[PDB]
């Protein structure tokens, strides 16, 4: 049992590393989306601020 | 170039009508007229125009007046003459208002008839300053055991409802309102809150279904509820807060107690950056215009607790922000934020996880705190508070389990407003310890059972700690006596 | 003097006409015509004798062709010892209804800073006995202070303990100056000195001056009324070689009133959304604050952080105008620990071992470290390290004391007590019997 | 005369437009009435925007302006030396006037490629982890970038004193001239600085030119330039120079103020679209000249505020993309005792191994190896690597305004590489170093003095040290 | 025609023209200037004024210059004797060598080959080089992005390049120098001095250079690519060559068309960038083309920023990108040169309609095993290394020798490295491969696999271990 539950742990925190890569890689994907979409709102809401002079 | 350079003006300026108490409309346009002439109008003077239509004067331009119409702009053409009327901005205030519906100007819009008062108020009135206030002392009860322990109210405060959509802000104001009906039914005339509620820029349907909310829970005979509505001209949301906070100014003056609810200021904000960028003033952040959080700040200012010199009224405000997907880090959002004397912060995973009052304790906040509680409250509450922070941190067995049973504990149905007493025979019940022997599903059937037992059984320890509003050693006795009776009946 | 006619009245701002005789820039105006002074600061020439100009309060009732008289001269406040104990407003008037403030001098808000050759190197470190502040970032007498934090971390009642013990413990004639905050607290602030006996109403022994521009007035009113409160304390400094203590309450408040008076004074605007001259002018503020070879100006400066960021302009701009900045979290704020200073972001420029000594800067690195890599023995030293940086009746820990109790801690010469012995107590001794009670009951 | 005398139009928050003028010079300094100055930035069809080297309340709409004729341009020379200016070269340490022979314009050209070479001899900071693992030459320009209050000013700092070995010595081409600017800075902060560099006697060879908060947008501006014309002084006449900018975040922050009241459109967070050519064209003129050109070189060691650690902001990302590398400060690092918190996986110097000493090399190739080895790690194997980690993490520690020689250094780095503190375990590093050091230098002057001769650990000199590291391990607590 | 200043603002100068406006695109000289200061026109605003954008400091300028047309968009010298040479923008020496003494002069701003000019077949450019001609081939009239950095040997790979497309057909090189600091300009100037792609003292120079440094105005960095664009079209359509134009950097030549469009006062779009982002791309990479004349094949060295790859520079960038090579420093670390990661490199002719089944097969075959290997890498840190496999060591050693075989001397690195540089055809790479593929040398060692040239090298060096 105790060879036999040292493999199981092992395996399971494969599974563990590779899930949470997988989240790693599309929460940067939206974090990249996020801060463009970031960068132009503001620039927009400089430029709509300096069309109204 | 520029607004009054245009051709007829010119042209009969140059070959050869009173322009200091009448104009005429250049341009109108999306609710904004250009008035040429006017020219000993004041700033945020009211004037008049042909058609019967009201307008306020927001920008005094060198050759023109940027003036926002109280309507459909369809009765104005450009040639139009507008007159000057001399006031500013007043609405009806007094007593006589007390269980109708009116509008952002003191127009009654419920069919009762016209109103009866006899005096009349600005809505641009400056707040009390330094010396005519004193501390806020005195509560003011909501009937909602989250909020009346954990983010106690008091009268003179300002309280900030925020949350997403369809998370239970109104419905914590509405509960708020008719909580107040045993103390108005009452004599003692010091306890006695009378509400208003601003509707600012929802539906008509919405208005009326809480006013029959209202007249259900007969707590309309000492409310006003001020609409503007959706379809409503920007100018009249913007100045419906405004008006109602004169209607409680009233109050407040007078030695009484009035509470006001602006639901909500999101939509006040909004139809103010409508008006400012369609009268061409520089944009902001998200749109907004620079003087928004001034708008914010001078209306919530105005709710004080005078003392006793100055007749000892109160105004309490609870402005209500709606954020979007949870994002308080807004604009509008941080300036009320910032405004007021703490939130209450009601969360949508609460709220379907059956936590109803959604209230979120770890981000809600009240700077009155404890000084705004009775002394059976307080005594309940510091121990109450104590064990949920504790719990949350390490969210320890007896933690966990300790902290899941005051979370069942905190919820409460909707229009059920419990009385003092009643909340601290609860929360005394459930800290003491006299739940730790219930598995948290219970916790519910159990609050319920018994204070159907402590309403019928135990009515005069009930109204001794409400004569003396704390938990006497002799009635400490008798609550201990009483949850360990029931405790072991229950099953 | 000069006369001009009001030409537009947009929101807050005016522009105003000069036939002759134009004021320069940042000159005071008045308005004649109306009940109570309403004062306009000049900002920008505009050209055909037209000048643009900053509201002091609403600007409602104006009228185009409004005459407006020219002062000659920045906005001036009564400076003196008979401003101490009173309360005015950001252009001198007393709001307190006792009465006119009969100084001997008047002084322009609007000054230069001092100059290189006047500036001091002299830093002595005022410990002012609570453990998370004296041990961790300590204050020193002279500089700049500064408190950040968000909305509900415990800034004013952080800033009310200084008030008290400081200000109490203290010879040098205070200034506070309420900047934007709520009307409410500053009533309460106001009784609450006046009964604590600082200050004193009658045979005036008042040792703190009061100035709040609150939140209901216009963006200009909360902008200047950082620079009164600064004209005060420059006063007690200057002319009377005082070393004063300047409580700002709140210096964020300044800044966004700044954010709100570039919005329509016609200037296009930066980042976030505040203006483009907020670095420099909140620098020509806050270089007056400082110790010169004549007196001292010690800061105490709440500011507050929008939306807990610290990377906002107006905060990150903030950091380096000031000596020891201690940071309250909304983190360990809803831990129930108080205050709610964050160990590792409340940085000291004092804090090395030339001027604190050896013992006080081992302990201050000491804590820190086992707090940021918070080995079971570790975390749990490094949670009653948590807990003991908590302070509630209030207590009274002196430096030594507490560097001593914090030592006792680190080592681990008090393993066995628990964890929540050391929340809300002072010293090691109160820990140790509060364990002791707590104890022997459960 | 409406060509060489201008009429003020308007004036606000710094900007003053100005009629006339018509044979003004673009970037040309005038001088208004009351004694201020200003620069000609936009010349335009109407009016001329300038850009006021003082306050608006002292100008005034009908105020005269009058032209000088020339570019904006500095004293340069030995004369400021000692001396504190401001971003003009007008004394501000009441010393008296600058005796400057020479002036020299600020906006220059950077040399070309011709006049160049590699970058070959070392600039020593002095510190460990920068001398051992971020290695900088003289004619780099190494970014100094980091949060708030994370320990930069305090690297140059002990650069600047570190040179005095050098500069109180004979070879008259190892001396090193320093220049600090001091871009919106507290004025109590840039005075305490002075301070500092002269009780270490760092003054004699340190210009300090300030451009404090309390300065007009134009002043914080130009300073930079003012100080790098200073330093390519040095540099075109065979002397080395280093000079700092501290910080650049805050230049471009006045850069940004001032086009944004001149109306120039802005970009991304308003910086106008020249902000990248703005620090460009700055910190392009720290170049090494080839022997035909006098072989001086200019060291620029810019200074750049992040905000949260966040890097890829436009001016980071600017400054980034324009120096040799970088040194990163961390907050996290600092309060976990590594201080100099220095983040050597993101460090960076491109130039750095073509300048280290050969001792150094030799020393901190195995270092960086295992440092790199360690943090891809952080059995019987690994543990091992990770504590060969923690024993070099632990030497890399420096206290404040005390730099060390660059044998120093290579005796510690050595004692730590070999295996020697393997014995030792973390907490004690720290002491025995310094006593280690005491040891090397009071009774063995002799190694310490030939392996700063001849640069290198030969094998003489290499046994010399094992046996010396071994005794006084075996003596040692 | 002779205008005058009327305005400078910055980089920005409007010029005021009495009779004769110079179209858009145009170079106007400034008079009196002590150096040669040239505008561009970018605009007509009116007026019989003209906005322009300088192409160098903008200091001194007085309103009221005398501004000159030149009727051309800028006239660079070109021919075969720019190469060894450097030259900006404007195409004047700055190498202080002397003048370039050509016989004709090409305008920049040029429009792309016709639509019936543009060869039609897509065909291998044969670069001599193992792991790219292989695994990731370059098209003729392609380009290339070099995702590589400075650790790596990335001069080296420029430099070895240049000499086999000189060698194996007759092409010359153009540098581009977009955005790039003088002090790597100058290192890879003595770099590529040194290694006898420029000579100094002879006519046999392989590259021509052109730079555009960092402290120049955003006119320039935005037209030195042009510049460069326009000294390799000259040899294509004047001498039938295959030329080969390297970009040490694309994103910069981005950034200083965002620079100028922000100057010149237009809204940005996305992040940032020009709205003209894609157009002023395409003008550009549009004429790196495959006519039929000759062919220009571009190698871009691409810098993407924030390690965002749907950037909008990096992502406008990758429209045009014919093919890839990621010069890995953990590939340098395990001793390979060229450091090209065999399995980050990606070529869009890899199909085996393009390069035949022959080439498509053993290329992917070699990728198999390489990721299968990587596999086994990571399976054999169980520290459990047996064999319970046969085939799983075979092809461990198979792929070894395969990876060490991805591994080649350059001539350009004989001065240093005592080794030969080999140059090895595409037939016999493919050979090469095919054979360690099919399992046949396995009694060879593993060292003989190292810094060879083809097979023939790798069996005598085999031979010669013992
Ligand atoms: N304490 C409660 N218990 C159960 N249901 C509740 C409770 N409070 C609110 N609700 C219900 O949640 C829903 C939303 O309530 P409510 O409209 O009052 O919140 P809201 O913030 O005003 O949302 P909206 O964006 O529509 O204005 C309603 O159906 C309401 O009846
Ligand atoms: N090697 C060190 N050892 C110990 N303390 C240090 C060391 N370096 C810096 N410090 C201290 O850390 C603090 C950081 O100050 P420092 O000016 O050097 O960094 P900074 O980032 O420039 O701060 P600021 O943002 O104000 O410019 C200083 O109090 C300094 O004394
Ligand atoms: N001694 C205390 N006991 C209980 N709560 C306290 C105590 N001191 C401060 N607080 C709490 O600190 C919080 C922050 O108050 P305040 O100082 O107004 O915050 P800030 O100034 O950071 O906006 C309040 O909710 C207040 O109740
Ligand atoms: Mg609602
Ligand atoms: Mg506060
Ligand atoms: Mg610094």
């Given at each position: 049992s105790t060879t036999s539950e040292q493999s199981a742990r092992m395996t399971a925190m494969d599974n563990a590393s590779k899930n949470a890569s997988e989240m790693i890689d599309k929460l940067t994907l939206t974090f990249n989306r996020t801060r463009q979409a970031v960068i132009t709102k503001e620039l927009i809401e400089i430029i709509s601020g300096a069309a109204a002079l | 170039t520029?607004?009054?350079?245009?051709?007829?003006i010119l042209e009969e300026r140059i070959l050869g009508v009173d322009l200091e108490e009448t104009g005429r409309v250049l341009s109108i346009g999306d609710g904004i007229a250009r008035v040429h002439g006017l020219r000993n109008v004041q700033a945020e003077e009211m004037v008049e125009f042909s058609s019967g239509l009201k307008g306020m004067s927001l920008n005094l331009e060198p050759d023109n007046v940027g003036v926002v119409v109280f309507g459909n702009d369809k009765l104005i053409k450009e040639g139009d003459i507008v007159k000057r009327t001399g006031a500013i901005v007043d609405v009806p205030v007094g007593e006589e208002l007390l269980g109708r519906v009116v509008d952002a100007l003191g127009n009654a819009i419920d069919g009762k008839g016209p109103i009866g008062s006899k005096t009349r108020r600005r809505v641009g009135l400056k707040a009390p300053g330094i010396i005519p206030r004193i501390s806020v002392r005195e509560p003011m009860q909501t009937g909602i055991k989250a909020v009346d322990s954990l983010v106690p109210i008091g009268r003179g405060q300002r309280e900030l409802i925020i949350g997403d959509r369809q998370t239970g802000k109104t419905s914590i104001a509405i509960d708020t309102i008719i909580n107040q009906k045993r103390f108005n039914d009452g004599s003692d005339e010091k306890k006695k809150l009378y509400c208003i509620y601003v509707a600012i820029g929802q539906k008509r349907s919405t208005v009326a279904q809480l006013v029959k909310r209202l007249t259900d829970a007969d707590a309309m005979k000492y409310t006003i509820v001020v609409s503007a509505t959706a379809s409503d001209a920007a100018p009249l949301q913007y100045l419906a807060p405004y008006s109602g906070c004169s209607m409680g100014e009233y109050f407040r003056d007078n030695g009484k107690h009035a509470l006001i609810i602006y639901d909500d200021l999101?939509?006040?904000?909004?139809?103010?950056?409508?008006?400012?960028?369609?009268?061409?003033?520089?944009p902001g952040r998200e749109?907004?215009?620079?003087?928004?959080?001034?708008?914010?700040?001078?209306?919530?200012?105005?709710?004080?607790?005078?003392?006793?010199?100055?007749?000892?009224?109160?105004?309490?405000?609870?402005?209500?922000?709606?954020?979007?997907?949870?994002?308080?880090?807004?604009?509008?959002?941080?300036?009320?934020?910032?405004?007021?004397?703490?939130?209450?912060?009601?969360?949508?995973?609460?709220?379907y996880k059956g936590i109803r009052?959604?209230?979120?304790?770890?981000?809600?906040?009240?700077?009155?705190?404890?000084?705004?509680?009775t002394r059976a409250m307080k005594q309940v509450a510091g121990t109450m508070k104590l064990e949920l922070a504790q719990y949350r941190e390490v969210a320890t067995q007896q933690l966990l389990s300790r902290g899941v049973r005051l979370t069942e504990l905190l919820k409460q149905g909707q229009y059920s407003p419990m009385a003092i007493e009643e909340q601290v025979a609860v929360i005394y019940a459930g800290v003491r310890g006299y739940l730790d022997k219930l598995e948290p599903s219970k916790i519910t059937k159990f609050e319920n059972a018994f204070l159907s037992h402590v309403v019928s059984q135990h009515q005069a320890l009930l109204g001794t700690i409400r004569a003396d509003g704390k938990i006497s050693e002799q009635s400490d006795a008798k609550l201990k006596e009483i949850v360990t009776n029931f405790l072991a009946g229950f099953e | 003097a000069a006369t001009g006619r009001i030409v537009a009245v947009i929101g807050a701002v005016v522009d105003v006409q000069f036939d002759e005789g134009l004021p320069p820039i940042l000159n005071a105006l008045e308005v004649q015509g109306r009940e109570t002074r309403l004062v306009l600061e000049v900002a920008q020439h505009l050209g055909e004798s037209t000048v643009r100009t900053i509201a002091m309060d609403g600007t409602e009732g104006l009228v185009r062709g409004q005459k407006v008289l020219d002062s000659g001269a920045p906005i001036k406040i009564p400076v003196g010892p008979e401003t101490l104990g009173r309360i005015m407003n950001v252009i001198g008037e007393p709001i307190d209804e006792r009465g006119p403030i009969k100084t001997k001098q008047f002084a322009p808000i609007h000054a230069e800073a001092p100059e290189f050759m006047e500036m001091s190197v002299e830093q002595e470190i005022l410990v002012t006995g609570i453990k998370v502040v004296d041990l961790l970032a300590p204050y020193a007498k002279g500089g700049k202070i500064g408190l950040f934090g968000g909305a509900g971390v415990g800034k004013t009642v952080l800033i009310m303990e200084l008030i008290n013990n400081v200000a109490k413990a203290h010879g040098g004639y205070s200034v506070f100056a309420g900047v934007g905050e709520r009307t409410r607290e500053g009533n309460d602030l106001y009784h609450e000195m006046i009964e604590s006996g600082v200050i004193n109403l009658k045979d005036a022994t008042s040792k703190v001056a009061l100035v709040?521009?609150?939140?209901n007035e216009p963006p200009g009113a909360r902008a200047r009324v950082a620079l009164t409160g600064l004209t005060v304390a420059?006063?007690?400094?200057?002319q009377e070689g005082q070393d004063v203590l300047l409580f700002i309450d709140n210096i964020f408040r300044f800044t966004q009133a700044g954010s709100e008076v570039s919005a329509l004074l016609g200037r296009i605007p930066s980042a976030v959304g505040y203006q483009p001259t907020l670095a420099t002018d909140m620098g020509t503020m806050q270089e007056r604050i400082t110790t010169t070879k004549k007196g001292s100006i010690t800061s105490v400066q709440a500011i507050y952080v929008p939306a807990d960021d610290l990377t906002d302009p107006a905060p990150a701009t903030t950091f380096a105008h000031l000596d020891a900045t201690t940071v309250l979290s909304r983190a360990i704020a809803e831990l129930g620990i108080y205050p709610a200073v964050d160990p590792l972001d409340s940085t000291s420029r004092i804090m090395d071992p030339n001027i604190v000594g050896?013992?006080?800067?081992?302990?201050?690195?000491?804590?820190?470290?086992?707090?940021?890599?918070?080995?079971?023995?570790?975390?749990?030293?490094?949670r009653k390290i948590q807990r003991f940086l908590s302070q509630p009746m209030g207590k009274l820990v002196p430096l030594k004391e507490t560097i001593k109790g914090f030592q006792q801690i680190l080592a681990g010469e008090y393993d066995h007590l628990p964890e929540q012995a050391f929340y809300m107590v002072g010293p090691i001794e109160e820990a140790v019997a509060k364990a002791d009670k707590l104890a022997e009951e459960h």
């Open positions: - | 520029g607004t009054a350079e245009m051709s007829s999101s939509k006040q904000a909004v139809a103010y950056r409508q008006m400012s960028l369609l009268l061409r003033r520089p749109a907004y215009p620079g003087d928004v959080f001034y708008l914010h700040s001078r209306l919530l200012e105005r709710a004080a607790k005078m003392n006793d010199a100055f007749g000892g009224g109160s105004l309490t405000a609870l402005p209500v922000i709606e954020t979007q997907a949870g994002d308080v880090s807004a604009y509008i959002p941080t300036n009320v934020i910032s405004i007021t004397d703490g939130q209450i912060f009601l969360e949508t995973e609460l709220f009052p959604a209230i979120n304790v770890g981000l809600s906040v009240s700077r009155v705190g404890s000084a705004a509680q | 709040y521009g609150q939140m420059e006063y007690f400094r200057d050896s013992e006080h800067y081992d302990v201050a690195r000491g804590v820190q470290k086992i707090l940021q890599d918070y080995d079971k023995l570790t975390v749990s030293r490094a």
